[PDB]
Amino acid sequence: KIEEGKLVIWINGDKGYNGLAEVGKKFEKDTGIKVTVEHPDKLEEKFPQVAATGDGPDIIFWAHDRFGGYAQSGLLAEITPDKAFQDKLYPFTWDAVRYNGKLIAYPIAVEALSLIYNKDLLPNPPKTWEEIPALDKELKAKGKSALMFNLQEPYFTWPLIAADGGYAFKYENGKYDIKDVGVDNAGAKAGLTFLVDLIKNKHMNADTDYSIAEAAFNKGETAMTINGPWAWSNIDTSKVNYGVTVLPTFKGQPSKPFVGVLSAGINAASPNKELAKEFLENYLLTDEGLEAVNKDKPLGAVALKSYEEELAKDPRIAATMENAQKGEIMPNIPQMSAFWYAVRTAVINAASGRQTVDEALKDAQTRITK
Numbered sequence: 001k002i003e004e005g006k007l008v009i010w011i012n013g014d015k016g017y018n019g020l021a022e023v024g025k026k027f028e029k030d031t032g033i034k035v036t037v038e039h040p041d042k043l044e045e046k047f048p049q050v051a052a053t054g055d056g057p058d059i060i061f062w063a064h065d066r067f068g069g070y071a072q073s074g075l076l077a078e079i080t081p082d083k084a085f086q087d088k089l090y091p092f093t094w095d096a097v098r099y100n101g102k103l104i105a106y107p108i109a110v111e112a113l114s115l116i117y118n119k120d121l122l123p124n125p126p127k128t129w130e131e132i133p134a135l136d137k138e139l140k141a142k143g144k145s146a147l148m149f150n151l152q153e154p155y156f157t158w159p160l161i162a163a164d165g166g167y168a169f170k171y172e173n174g175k176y177d178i179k180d181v182g183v184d185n186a187g188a189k190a191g192l193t194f195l196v197d198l199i200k201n202k203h204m205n206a207d208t209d210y211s212i213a214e215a216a217f218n219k220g221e222t223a224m225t226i227n228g229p230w231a232w233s234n235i236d237t238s239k240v241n242y243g244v245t246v247l248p249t250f251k252g253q254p255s256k257p258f259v260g261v262l263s264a265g266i267n268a269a270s271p272n273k274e275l276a277k278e279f280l281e282n283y284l285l286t287d288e289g290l291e292a293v294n295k296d297k298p299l300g301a302v303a304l305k306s307y308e309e310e311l312a313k314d315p316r317i318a319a320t321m322e323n324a325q326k327g328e329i330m331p332n333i334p335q336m337s338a339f340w341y342a343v344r345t346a347v348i349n350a351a352s353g354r355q356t357v358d359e360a361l362k363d364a365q366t367r368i369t370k
Ligand SMILES: OC[C@H]1O[C@@H]2O[C@H]3[C@H](O)[C@@H](O)[C@@H](O[C@H]4[C@H](O)[C@@H](O)[C@@H](O[C@H]5[C@H](O)[C@@H](O)[C@@H](O[C@H]6[C@H](O)[C@@H](O)[C@@H](O[C@H]7[C@H](O)[C@@H](O)[C@@H](O[C@H]8[C@H](O)[C@@H](O)[C@@H](O[C@H]1[C@H](O)[C@H]2O)O[C@@H]8CO)O[C@@H]7CO)O[C@@H]6CO)O[C@@H]5CO)O[C@@H]4CO)O[C@@H]3CO
Pocket: 014, 063, 065, 111, 153, 154, 155, 156, 210, 228, 230, 260, 336, 337, 340
């Protein structure tokens, strides 16, 4: 069902889909071509189903990590932007959208975790992970804790584990080596061990989940937290006086948060590929375009250098980018579902003495490169 002479875009419901529409209206003015933005529930699952049979939308919006699965099944058309369009986005962001050495989507927005702190309790954030244990005792003397984050999820603990050497899969060129996993090196042990210590010296609680670390920061009980752009909305509400800054270093090495890139890909089945290419590169990927979606619902840090510079006037955004420029692009290969599951295990076991650091990581690694 190659609709033809139309544009149909699929975007998640929690995004700036009305702003996106106005861009669509703009397009419709210089072209006569109708745009249509929809936000169907479970679009990330419906896409692969409808597209396998030459259906779905012309363009799909989703975080880049799902795009590798789509591309393996040849659901996404390859893109060919020119060097001069390429130089308009941050370099790092193009590597988020290369599958099998091919460009499969356009990078929109960039997300990464940041260190969020209570300005009131902690007038100056720690620049070191090593210096947090002291801060905790220092702060516990007044009834408050130093830090509180999601420990139940690998996404949240990786920044530290990867700080000194850890990685998921090696990127030596534009391909990921699926047998070269960095969960069992020196660096990962150094970082996981540091984390275990925090739990063992009662500086941290082993069952602290997302909702527990949020409640705590937000009620003013703890002085720091580790969260993303999606979380800001609730703190505003909470009325806390927070700041957002770079992640602490570990052994003098930066924390390595995973990076997620919001991306737009074109259905391999679209008859409208040149139309979509036109709309993306010249209508959406411009200052007036990112601004129109953004006014509807913030995007965070964007990949468009020009607009980034203006957005980065909000220290929360500049910090997100700073963190993403130090982070680890979340690999988009199918093997990643192997890393999650196994890393969630290695960490939980280490944090509850159910297995040492050296035991957990080693069995994690065999599981992954299995
Ligand atoms: O119940 C909650 C959730 O249930 C359903 O989701 C299931 C999902 O469909 C399955 O695919 C599976 O997911 C596993 C996944 O495949 C594994 O790879 C791993 O997940 C990793 C992610 O793939 C990886 O991207 C990363 O994730 C981080 C995100 O990138 C990052 O943006 C952030 O996420 C925050 C969201 O941005 C924010 O909107 C908010 O999320 C709410 C969702 O929007 C909303 O859909 C719903 O989620 C349902 C979902 O609809 C069902 O499909 O509620 C969410 C509130 O929790 O907040 C997010 C932060 O909480 O953060 C994350 C890391 O959390 O890393 C992860 C691994 O660390 O594991 C997945 C299973 O754990 O299973 C889930 C059901 O559990």
